[PDB]
Amino acid sequence: MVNNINWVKLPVILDRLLRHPLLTDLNLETAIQYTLDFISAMGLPNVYVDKIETIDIKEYRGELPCDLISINQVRLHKNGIALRAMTDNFNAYPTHGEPSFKTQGRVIFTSIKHEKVDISYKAIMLDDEGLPLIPDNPIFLKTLELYIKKEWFTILFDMGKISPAVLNNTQQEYAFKAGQCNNEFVIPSVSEMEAITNMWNQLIPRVTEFRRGFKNLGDKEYIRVH
Amino acid sequence: MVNNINWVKLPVILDRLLRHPLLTDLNLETAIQYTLDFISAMGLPNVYVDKIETIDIKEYRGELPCDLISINQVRLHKNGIALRAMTDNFNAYPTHGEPSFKTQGRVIFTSIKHEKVDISYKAIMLDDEGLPLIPDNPIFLKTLELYIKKEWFTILFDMGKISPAVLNNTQQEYAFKAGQCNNEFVIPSVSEMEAITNMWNQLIPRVTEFRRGFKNLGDKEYIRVH
Amino acid sequence: MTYNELIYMVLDELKLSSDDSYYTPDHVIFLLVKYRSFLLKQRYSDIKKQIPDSDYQSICLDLIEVPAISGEPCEGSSYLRSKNKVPTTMMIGNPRVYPMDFYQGEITYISRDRMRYVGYNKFLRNIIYCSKAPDGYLYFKSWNPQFLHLEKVSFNAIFEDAKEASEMACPEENGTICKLEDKEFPIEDALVPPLIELVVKELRGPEYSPKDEDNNAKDDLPDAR
Amino acid sequence: MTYNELIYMVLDELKLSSDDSYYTPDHVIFLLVKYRSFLLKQRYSDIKKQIPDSDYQSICLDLIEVPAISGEPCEGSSYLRSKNKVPTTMMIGNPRVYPMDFYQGEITYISRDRMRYVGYNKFLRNIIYCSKAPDGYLYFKSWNPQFLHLEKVSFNAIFEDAKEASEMACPEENGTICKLEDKEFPIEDALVPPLIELVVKELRGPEYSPKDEDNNAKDDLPDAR
């Protein structure tokens, strides 16, 4: 992402929607739900807050933080060696290796019995209220506004209170801005294309960046003169 | 960009809109919001002001300036060596290199504990009032005018107060001028095609311009006679 | 305009000046309230238009904590509810329950069918919900125990019966208004000529229609008495 | 034209010359104000046209700082509001609150639903907003503490009731106008023949309609007395 994510409260999206006199029955409560549907459906990893927590595994199980949304990596605390993924069907089960993890709910399922693990994860940024906080990006803000205008107009079109030409314009305009908003958040900055440059140009290919926290991923590869 | 960015106040866009008798209920308040949506959606890096600030990092964290919109580069203050990007998942976190940075809000997250860093960034140019200042470019000004005329007519088309032929003409005319305005600001001047010429024509390829502030990027490559 | 000016236009359009007349101002008050919600539903229910501020009324409510069913422990959490019954809103505008400041608060008036499933979202648990149960009362609901301290809300909506919402009206700066007739009638001034035309058309024909004049233990209407 | 010329055309079109007549100038003042907003909504609400300067009225307001709810600290920031109630604007023109100079100031009249969410943008915090709360008063709002020093604004809009906005009218160079009838009636001169036709058509039929002439404790309208 080229621009920085400056945070603003959710009611800044309601100044923009209630400029439209057909969207004047909108609420904070409706703006809360349609934001989280929009934040999810875009899947932009720049909208989330990166956190790291150390949890302790009791017997192939550990309790996961409350704010966790997606795990970046799980690693061991004493080694720093990262855990990949549990493909075993019979993991902590005895009959009569490379460590792994698996997460379903608020429980993580590891391959190690009694160990502390660091979990680097993503959460949602909150307010003084326990409410979501959105980027002030006028591309993000415009297409979140067009998201809610397209969900409200879809209800109104089912009711028969909106022209099919009106909904077709809103469905088209949200469809353009959703790609512009995707490209706004995905396309790297100059400082991220340098780390992409160093990963791409490697005379001796570095193929074990998952073992670290992808720390040396964008590091530059140097060759001695001889 | 070929032309210089001479700055004018936001009400110069309102002389042009209120020539249209259907846009006579427009305000400064509506011109402020639709300008910032337009400035963002175009993403022209010539509309922003380049600033440089030195901030001090306390422990892998530093407080970012208030006007910051996008970082050009972050570099170290004592060395001048530039920082690339944080790909580490477990950065300032201990267990039991090439420096980096990461920015989310008003906080920057670096790889260096106690250090001063220079941040070259972009901000918005303001007035005597704390309000945006727009280029006087009659291509920029015309397509910002067509932007606001297309957002106001889209509301009026949803209300049923505008013909679908009227909105289709405004959506077409904004669509042409938005590409003309993009090419007006992107296509280099004669003096920027010379720096592009020197980067492109390089017998010994210079592939480390990020380490400097891209200072020697457009420098001419000289070969000795032998 | 007030209630009085609308009554006395329909009376004077019908020339119902006499005290010994068949159709009283109560026939006119009834028909003006019925033709208000008739006419607002004819304009504002097919496709969505801007509703003017004139069609709304703000009523004031006192809220009391009531149980879910009775005084039993395993029935469920208690609600707040209005001590008096609330008018039925029309589904054409922006109903709004607010804590005596219209520009503040998030109290959400919703459907009664929706309010039995609300607040299961972790980000929507500090929001107070409103609906009108078939008891006729406005009920309140949230997962936040703090909502049980509300003593008073105001309810701005386009209610179906304009007379019901004028007796529950908010106190003025001067004070309460004793007579319904000195209170504001809630319709846009652009809908008053179609409102007066329909109420006059309904009573114009019956105004000149015959009566059973004679007290003779017999119906004298087929004779046009 | 003034109010008087429009009253006395409809009276003379109906030939209501006699002082002992049923329909007074107050029946005509009422119907001219009702058919003004009826006719302006018929012309200027479907698709967007230029509105002439004749349909607007400028009213003068005194603003006072009022609390959000009461004198409590944790309720929220206070507002300015008009000391008297304001007329309801129609949604057809360019309403404009301005600090006694029309060509100056950025005070933004908006929706009441919008004004509870305004000024969260960092570039829109020195802008004063206006709406008409369901109290009937015009409220003011900004994040700038300087806005609480406004003592006076003028409000130019196409209000629904033209009589309400003529009693709140701005003082002239000469002085205030005592009688409503010597004040300007706010409609374009191209809409005056359709306005006079509808007010005359409403009162022409009832002008010749019979009355309950006899004082005999009986309704005499079915007999066409």
Residue numbers in the entry:
A (entry chain B), B (entry chain B): 1 to 96, 107 to 236
C (entry chain C), D (entry chain C): 1 to 225
Please give the exact wording used by the authors of the publication that reports this structure.
Virus ΦcrAss001 (Kehishuvirus primarius) was the first representative of this order to be isolated in pure culture from human faecal samples. Here, we present the characterization of ΦcrAss001 using cryo-electron microscopy (cryo-EM), enabling de novo structure building and elucidation of functions for around 1,440 protein subunits constituting the virion, leading to the identification of a novel ‘crass fold’ in the distal part of the tail. The virion possesses a short non-contractile tail extending approximately 44 nm from an icosahedral capsid. The extended tail barrel formed by widely conserved paralogous ring proteins has a high capacity for storage of cargo proteins alongside the capsid cargo zone, ensuring that the proteins required for the initial stages of crassvirus infection are carried inside virions and delivered to the host cell.
The majority of the portal protein oligomer exhibits 12-fold symmetry and the localized reconstruction imposing C12 symmetry enabled structure determination at 3.09 Å resolution. The majority of the portal protein residues, except for some flexible loop segments (33–35, 68–71, 269–324 and 550–563), could be confidently modelled. At the top of the portal protein, an extended α-helical barrel (C-terminal residues 672–739) extends around 80 Å towards the core of the capsid. This extended feature has an internal van der Waals diameter of around 45 Å at the base of the crown and around 25 Å at its exposed end. The main body of the portal protein beneath the Crown domain is made up of the stem domain, composed of α-helices defining its central tunnel, and the wing domain. Tunnel loops, which are not defined in maps owing to their apparent flexibility, connect the inner stem helix (residues 519–541) with a 34-residue-long kinked helix that is part of the wing. These tunnel loops (residues 550–563) are likely to form a narrow constriction in the portal tunnel, as observed in portal proteins of other viruses. At the surface of the portal wing, there is clear density corresponding to residues 425–552 of the gp45 cargo protein C1. Twelve such segments of gp45 interdigitate with wing loops (SH3-like domains) of the portal, residues 337–380.
